[PDB]
Amino acid sequence: KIEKWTYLELKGSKANEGVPQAMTAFAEFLNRTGIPINPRFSPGMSMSVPGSEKEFFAKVKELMSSHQFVVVLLPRKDVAIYNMVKRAADITFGVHTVCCVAEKFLSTKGQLGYFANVGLKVNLKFG
């Protein structure tokens, strides 16, 4: 059972709406599909994309070292931001991160299908 988790939101041009609410929906989804997780998350973090990996690691370091699981929302399917996230996760102990595109994670049509795909990655990390 994932007990301590939160989310990290990497800002794009447009502001994301309904994030906390979708995170709750996501946790419910995970529980229904056989991945036990506390239905409640600790308050999430939102930040613009920093200029360097060092700057990024400094910012998210406490977040990632104090949680078992972090759901990360990226503004676009940009593999460079994705890599920045994976580098920090690579040197952090006791945490798993999963990266998602914000629009897909939030948009009503196709949300459940997307949740299901993201759940594949989550399952592999814990199951």
Side-chain angles (χ1 to χ4, degrees):
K1 190 192 185 194
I2 305 163
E3 198 68 27
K4 287 187 178 182
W5 69 281
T6 191
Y7 64 90
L8 177 66
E9 193 180 340
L10 305 184
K11 294 183 180 165
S13 55
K14 58 176 182 180
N16 299 321
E17 310 294 351
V19 175
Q21 291 81 15
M23 291 294 164
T24 301
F26 185 52
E28 307 263 81
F29 180 92
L30 294 184
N31 278 304
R32 302 191 61 199
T33 55
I35 304 167
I37 184 170
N38 191 343
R40 305 179 147 81
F41 48 90
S42 50
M45 176 178 289
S46 293
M47 56 183 288
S48 293
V49 183
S52 65
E53 185 59 38
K54 171 183 154 183
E55 196 183 344
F56 172 84
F57 180 75
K59 293 203 169 192
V60 303
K61 166 175 163 61
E62 209 272 341
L63 181 88
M64 292 187 56
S65 62
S66 56
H67 298 90
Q68 297 165 304
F69 177 58
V70 186
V71 185
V72 184
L73 305 180
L74 313 188
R76 283 148 264 280
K77 211 176 183 179
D78 174 347
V79 64
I81 311 187
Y82 170 83
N83 283 333
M84 171 171 318
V85 174
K86 286 333 226 186
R87 292 190 58 194
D90 189 36
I91 43 168
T92 304
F93 282 76
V95 68
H96 289 284
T97 67
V98 69
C99 291
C100 305
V101 179
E103 187 279 333
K104 295 262 231 178
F105 191 88
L106 302 173
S107 174
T108 305
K109 277 177 185 169
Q111 187 187 54
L112 291 174
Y114 193 66
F115 278 4
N117 294 339
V118 177
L120 293 171
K121 299 195 291 181
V122 178
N123 177 73
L124 286 180
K125 292 167 186 299
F126 292 95

